[PDB]
Amino acid sequence: PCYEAVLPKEKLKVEHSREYKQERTYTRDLLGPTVSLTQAAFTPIPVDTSQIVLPPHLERIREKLAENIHELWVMNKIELGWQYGPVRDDNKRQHPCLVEFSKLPEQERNYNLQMSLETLKTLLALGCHVGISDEHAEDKVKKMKLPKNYQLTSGYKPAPMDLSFIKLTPSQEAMVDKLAENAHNVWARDRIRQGWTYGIQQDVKNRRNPRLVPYTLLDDRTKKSNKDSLREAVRTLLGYGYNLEAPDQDHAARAEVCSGTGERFRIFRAEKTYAVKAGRWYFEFETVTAGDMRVGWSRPGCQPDQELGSDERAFAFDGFKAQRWHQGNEHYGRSWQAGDVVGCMVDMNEHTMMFTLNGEILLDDSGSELAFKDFDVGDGFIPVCSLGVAQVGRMNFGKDVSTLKYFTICGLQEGYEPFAVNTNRDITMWLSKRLPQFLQVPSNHEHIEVTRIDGTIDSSPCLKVTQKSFGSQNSNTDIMFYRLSMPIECAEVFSKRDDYDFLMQTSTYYYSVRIFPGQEPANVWVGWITSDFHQYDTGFDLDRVRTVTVTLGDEKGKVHESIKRSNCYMVCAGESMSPGQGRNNNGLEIGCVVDAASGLLTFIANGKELSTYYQVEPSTKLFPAVFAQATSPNVFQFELGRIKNVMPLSAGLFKSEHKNPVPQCPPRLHVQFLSHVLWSRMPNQFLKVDVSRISERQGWLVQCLDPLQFMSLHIPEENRSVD
Amino acid sequence: KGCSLTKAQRDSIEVCLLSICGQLRPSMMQHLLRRLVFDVPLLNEHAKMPLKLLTNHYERCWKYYCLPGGWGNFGAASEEELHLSRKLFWGIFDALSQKKYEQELFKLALPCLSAVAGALPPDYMESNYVSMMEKQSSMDSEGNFNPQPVDTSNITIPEKLEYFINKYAEHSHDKWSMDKLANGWIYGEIYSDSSKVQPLMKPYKLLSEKEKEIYRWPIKESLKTMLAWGWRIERTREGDSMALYNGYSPRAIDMSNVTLSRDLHAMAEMMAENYHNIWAKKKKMELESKGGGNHPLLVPYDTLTAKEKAKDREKAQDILKFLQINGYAVSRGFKDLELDTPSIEKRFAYSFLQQLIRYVDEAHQYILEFDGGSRGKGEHFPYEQEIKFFAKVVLPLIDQYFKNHRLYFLSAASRPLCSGGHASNKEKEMVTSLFCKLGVLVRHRISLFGNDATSIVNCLHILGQTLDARTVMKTGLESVKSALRAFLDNAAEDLEKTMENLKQGQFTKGVTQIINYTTVALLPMLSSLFEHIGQHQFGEDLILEDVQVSCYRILTSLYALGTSKSIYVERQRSALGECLAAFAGAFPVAFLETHLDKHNIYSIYNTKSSRERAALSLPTNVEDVCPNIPSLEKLMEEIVELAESGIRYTQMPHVMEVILPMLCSYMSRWWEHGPENNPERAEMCCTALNSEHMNTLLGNILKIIYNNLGIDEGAWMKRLAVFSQPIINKVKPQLLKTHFLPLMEKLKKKAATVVSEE
Numbered sequence A: 001p002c003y004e005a006v007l008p009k010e011k012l013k014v015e016h017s018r019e020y021k022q023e024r025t026y027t028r029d030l031l032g033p034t035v036s037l038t039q040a041a042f043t044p045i046p047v048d049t050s051q052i053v054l055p056p057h058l059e060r061i062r063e064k065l066a067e068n069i070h071e072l073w074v075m076n077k078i079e080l081g082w083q084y085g086p087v088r089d090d091n092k093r094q095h096p097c098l099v100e101f102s103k104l105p106e107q108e109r110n111y112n113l114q115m116s117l118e119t120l121k122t123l124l125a126l127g128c129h130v131g132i133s134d135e136h137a138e139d140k141v142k143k144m145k146l147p148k149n150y151q152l153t154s155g156y157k158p159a160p161m162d163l164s165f166i167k168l169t170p171s172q173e174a175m176v177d178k179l180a181e182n183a184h185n186v187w188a189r190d191r192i193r194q195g196w197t198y199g200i201q202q203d204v205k206n207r208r209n210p211r212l213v214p215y216t217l218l219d220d221r222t223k224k225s226n227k228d229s230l231r232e233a234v235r236t237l238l239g240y241g242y243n244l245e246a247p248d249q250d251h252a253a254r255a256e257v258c259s260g261t262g263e264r265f266r267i268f269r270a271e272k273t274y275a276v277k278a279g280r281w282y283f284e285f286e287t288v289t290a291g292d293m294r295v296g297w298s299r300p301g302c303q304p305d306q307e308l309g310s311d312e313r314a315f316a317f318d319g320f321k322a323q324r325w326h327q328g329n330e331h332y333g334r335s336w337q338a339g340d341v342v343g344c345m346v347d348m349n350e351h352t353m354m355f356t357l358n359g360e361i362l363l364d365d366s367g368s369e370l371a372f373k374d375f376d377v378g379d380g381f382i383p384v385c386s387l388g389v390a391q392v393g394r395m396n397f398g399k400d401v402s403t404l405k406y407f408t409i410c411g412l413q414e415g416y417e418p419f420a421v422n423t424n425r426d427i428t429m430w431l432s433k434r435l436p437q438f439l440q441v442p443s444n445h446e447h448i449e450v451t452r453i454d455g456t457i458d459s460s461p462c463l464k465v466t467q468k469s470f471g472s473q474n475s476n477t478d479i480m481f482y483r484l485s486m487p488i489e490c491a492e493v494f495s496k497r498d499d500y501d502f503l504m505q506t507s508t509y510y511y512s513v514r515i516f517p518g519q520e521p522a523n524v525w526v527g528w529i530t531s532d533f534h535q536y537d538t539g540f541d542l543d544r545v546r547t548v549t550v551t552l553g554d555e556k557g558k559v560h561e562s563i564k565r566s567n568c569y570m571v572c573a574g575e576s577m578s579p580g581q582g583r584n585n586n587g588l589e590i591g592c593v594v595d596a597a598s599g600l601l602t603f604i605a606n607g608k609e610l611s612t613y614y615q616v617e618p619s620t621k622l623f624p625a626v627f628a629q630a631t632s633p634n635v636f637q638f639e640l641g642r643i644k645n646v647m648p649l650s651a652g653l654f655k656s657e658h659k660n661p662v663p664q665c666p667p668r669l670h671v672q673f674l675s676h677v678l679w680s681r682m683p684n685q686f687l688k689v690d691v692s693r694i695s696e697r698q699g700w701l702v703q704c705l706d707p708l709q710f711m712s713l714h715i716p717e718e719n720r721s722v723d
Numbered sequence B: 001k002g003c004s005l006t007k008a009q010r011d012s013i014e015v016c017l018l019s020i021c022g023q024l025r026p027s028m029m030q031h032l033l034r035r036l037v038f039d040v041p042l043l044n045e046h047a048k049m050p051l052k053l054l055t056n057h058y059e060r061c062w063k064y065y066c067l068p069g070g071w072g073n074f075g076a077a078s079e080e081e082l083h084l085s086r087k088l089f090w091g092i093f094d095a096l097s098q099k100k101y102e103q104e105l106f107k108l109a110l111p112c113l114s115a116v117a118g119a120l121p122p123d124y125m126e127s128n129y130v131s132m133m134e135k136q137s138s139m140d141s142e143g144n145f146n147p148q149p150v151d152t153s154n155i156t157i158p159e160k161l162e163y164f165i166n167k168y169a170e171h172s173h174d175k176w177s178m179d180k181l182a183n184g185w186i187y188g189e190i191y192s193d194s195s196k197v198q199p200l201m202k203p204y205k206l207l208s209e210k211e212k213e214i215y216r217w218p219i220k221e222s223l224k225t226m227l228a229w230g231w232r233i234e235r236t237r238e239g240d241s242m243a244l245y246n247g248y249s250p251r252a253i254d255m256s257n258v259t260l261s262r263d264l265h266a267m268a269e270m271m272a273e274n275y276h277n278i279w280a281k282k283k284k285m286e287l288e289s290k291g292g293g294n295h296p297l298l299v300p301y302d303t304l305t306a307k308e309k310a311k312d313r314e315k316a317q318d319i320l321k322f323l324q325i326n327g328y329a330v331s332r333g334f335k336d337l338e339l340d341t342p343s344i345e346k347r348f349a350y351s352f353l354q355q356l357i358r359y360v361d362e363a364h365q366y367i368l369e370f371d372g373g374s375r376g377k378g379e380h381f382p383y384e385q386e387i388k389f390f391a392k393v394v395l396p397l398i399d400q401y402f403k404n405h406r407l408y409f410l411s412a413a414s415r416p417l418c419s420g421g422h423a424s425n426k427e428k429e430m431v432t433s434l435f436c437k438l439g440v441l442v443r444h445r446i447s448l449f450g451n452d453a454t455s456i457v458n459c460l461h462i463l464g465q466t467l468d469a470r471t472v473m474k475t476g477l478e479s480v481k482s483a484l485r486a487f488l489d490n491a492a493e494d495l496e497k498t499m500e501n502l503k504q505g506q507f508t509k510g511v512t513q514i515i516n517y518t519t520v521a522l523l524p525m526l527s528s529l530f531e532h533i534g535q536h537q538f539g540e541d542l543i544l545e546d547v548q549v550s551c552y553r554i555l556t557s558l559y560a561l562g563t564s565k566s567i568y569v570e571r572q573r574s575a576l577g578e579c580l581a582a583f584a585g586a587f588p589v590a591f592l593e594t595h596l597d598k599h600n601i602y603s604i605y606n607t608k609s610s611r612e613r614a615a616l617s618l619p620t621n622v623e624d625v626c627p628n629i630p631s632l633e634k635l636m637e638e639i640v641e642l643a644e645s646g647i648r649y650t651q652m653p654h655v656m657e658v659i660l661p662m663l664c665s666y667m668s669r670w671w672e673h674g675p676e677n678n679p680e681r682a683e684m685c686c687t688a689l690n691s692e693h694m695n696t697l698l699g700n701i702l703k704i705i706y707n708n709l710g711i712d713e714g715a716w717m718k719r720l721a722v723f724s725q726p727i728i729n730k731v732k733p734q735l736l737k738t739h740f741l742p743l744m745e746k747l748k749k750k751a752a753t754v755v756s757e758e
């Protein structure tokens, strides 16, 4: 059952899958990128110690550590009122650990012998330098009170010395905690090797243990058991005089970089239509948490991917570093805390701007109260906010003046108006889009440049992709994703000189991609993609592509039909090429062949049919695409040519040229590339959904009873729809 | 550096160079630094310009080289220039120490040392692996051009490289196939530049090995020089791809698209410099065989221009890129041998203050033998330049260093300078030992100092700001601990003897020198210690045991100073008063609070056991040990009665100006140590002084100044106002409204006086 997967501390709820719900505009908690939830997969990672060999001192004292651990059993089982016997059964209260290591099972005796050995070896690998102090600390042994209850049956008396006069330094105690965590990891790893898996309840038939949890999630009772055992062991090792000069407290910087995907910040802004060119305007930003947040005023040309205030589009205030941001960063104001409310003011007439923290005006390094001395009206300013990893913020446009918390003490007397002071509707709020989309390559792109080569009498029309960043710094060594703007439609139903009749009845289309010499071929992939391809990964491989295998069977269970669906049908040039590094002399023309009537995708490379082939589902829209990491100024080029008995690409793409064998490159077709510079519109209203637990008898109830609808503008060529 | 120029020509070249370097981008000047590195320590006539350039450019890059990030647009340090600059500082400092004192040159070089010392990060780890194989072409003693390369005849190329040799000779034969095609030569019987007929159309496979060896010999020497430098070469599977793969026209290959890495670029920059050194050796032999002349490229490779660098750059590029295509992996010449980062000794500040404390102890023993021999007729200084260099460079060097590193010396990675860069615990121990050495150096030597005693008291002040008591106590060598204890005890004893000679010398020779030494050095430096310790909160914990009785002695002496009355006392009264205010903050016991002194368990008078009551000599009472000091409520009766008196600043100034800074410096700290400010142990804690009572004291002082206006007042109550803005801030704003606002309007009446009223 699915309830057994809940982590012990958390309680099971049923939430919205997406972050934002229907609620009040000023109470809507704007959320930044969330921390990646890697703690679900509890992989017990041990510190490697097999490579390390015992130093000579530890080697000659290994027998004394074996005696010490024997003393540990014979105290533990005797300090708990327990007695001795062959079978380790807790009901009859019999244990062989209270007796000599000889009668004690040699296998577990040696197991604990060496797990204490790699205990000290984990100390060594942790920098704990366990060396003898003097021969006094071994020659002297103290005597403990040994009543009949504390009495044992073996000769190894559990009275080395009282550990009260022996103190373990705080860093050493922390490392004891760390090594207990390591021992818990060892235990969990052994259970994984036997195949144990975690379950909230404990079972032996399913062979499932709630104890299979990270040490942080471990229960305090087992924590303290392992704690006392291992602390007593380390204390007795110190009592043996092998003092360990503790390795330093090496401070660690977690760097707060654990965001899911490459997104570092989420930028929220109002609609461009609400830009202000004149007047005094005020709005409040409530910080639920303290962290990497920026609030201020931005121009309508603000880019959702660049951070606020790095360049000229935005005028923001970062309180985390207490710095104002406009084309740079200068010290300004103070740092906020959780719950602090920032109030932003703008004078469009006096060309001044300043901020407040809980009412008081923030001061510059100089005594002046203006955050930004002077600027230009331009196209107007709009409220903006950027939220870092695991950051929650609230933006109040002051539609309801009472909801503003510090407007009365600051802003009202100065004549500043709330940004939504006179509005009948709530302000539409635009956010940076998480999911990348394909768009036409800009002519002003700082790294990508595309040229259109007309088709001559002997050359087919070509589209050439070049990088202007190469030969200079800031060249992005990242895999760019390219595609053509117009798709091929496979047949709605699948059927179960070249001839000017076969070429007229055929439905097989072709395009070729030539990898320019010096561009590494294994860094370039050629093939087709569908409209669903929205994956932007710095590292791309054909094994990582999204796939699913829908199998439909008849009534017994026989699989009469198997369909594999994928958004990427592409091949690598490095594997397609046979001659290896001896090539790159010239050429590498990868050919893509698509059969719109049968859905067969066949690839040719330098005139040979490649082994890889893809069978696609009827009515699939395939976009010619090439993914490449550019290692040369000239990287690949689309050739819209044709081969014998194979229709040109333009014939498939366009309907007016359906029966035209001459290859063509109409202006509609253009190279498109994947990027993250796009804004998304948050809906003004959301569905009214309520979720609650009816009972343990009935479960969790979800209920939506109000109908909401929106117009969807469907772009026919790109097979996508937007509100 | 040329000497044929006139004085005006030298001035013009110096101004031009200092301007160009002054606005020059900081990273670009690395080659110029490393050329200057060996020429600066000469300290010849030419060296003033290097000293000024060092000073100005390091002062410009004070932020850059210290900050681990530096200036973000200009980046940060490379640590190679840091290793060079430490050598600069050490060479300059040691040379100047050993060689004769010239006043102008050493006042010019002192700011250079200050700038270098500041720019060098004190926390810097002197790596066990530093810059080595120092390019010696710039190390020619004359003309900084001795282009000897690294000899490589001893080493021998191994066998797996023969296939690389064949393939690279194939590339060479190909590019000369293109060369002959480009300049026009074609196949024929014999080689001829006349008709462009030229017989090398034949392939590499069948080319004659003599003519092949003509291609080897440059390739062979290049590979030998590559191997001698130590570069590890590793073999990949792309190489055996070729083996499995296995006249003519060498068909179009595409070189330019590949690119190298930055480490390999520096690597290739040095190989190109090596090749220029081989070329320059050949040119030196041919020029010496000629017997005379010069060549435009005779200047070193770093002095060269890009156009002649282009040939070396491209020919290194080509072999490198073909080496990637062949699959070899070239690395650095030699692996790291060991790391000296674990030891705090290699920390730059540690070694700096190491040789600094050796020099300070040397100067202290020199002044000891001068105290011995100064009774002899000969007053000449055999170590003249030693002590003048010390006092006017080292002491200013210490001052500027500790000023530039205010936070570093206070930094222990325990949040002071939390970004990093901590002064080690042993470093702060040895800072304290430097303070002790400066003190024992300054005891009763003011007359022997040539008016540099003011510089020395500023030095003691700065060393007083640079202290870390927690670190010294929890980790401190017993010798340094005893040094600091003997420090405090000797200062107390010096003040006690000056108190006793001032009671016996109540009426107002060597005693004049002693009292001037006291009032100019000893009282100000103790006051600086007291201010630092109280402000930086380590007063209470610097003061635990027997340091408490030492400070009891100092308190008795300081209160005797406050009750002593003379004309010279009035002249030096401001220093006395600031010493009083500083020590009140430093002193941990509410000595005024006669009734509530004893109960504090935190005092020596509670930790004092009984056996060592009897062991020490004690009056057995916190009030009997300080009989003269009055009870707090009795002084506050005094303060109120002086309210109703309104005594004049020229008639009755002594008690009324001595007590006010005392009480202000008291209650400033023992309010927040009061009974309401400490919720724990309330009215049973250190003090009982509260907001209403200090508010009465505010109105009281500000009521006396009302009568004091009649004699036009004095500056020391403006100093009280300076002390009291902290008081005004730490008093609750509610007490400001309706009581202190009427004080602002009352002082608005007081605005008639020309003096600035708050």
Ligand SMILES: Nc1ncnc2c1ncn2[C@@H]1O[C@H](COP(=O)(O)OP(=O)(O)OP(=O)(O)O)[C@@H](O)[C@H]1O
Binding pocket: A088, A095, A097, A108, A187, A191, A209, A211
């Ligand atoms: N007195 C003892 N009690 C428990 N374990 C002991 C004892 N003496 C030695 N051991 C060793 O410690 C191991 C841990 O035993 P324990 O009872 O803690 O089982 P476990 O691994 O926690 O079980 P599970 O995986 O079923 O939750 C034993 O398998 C044995 O090798």
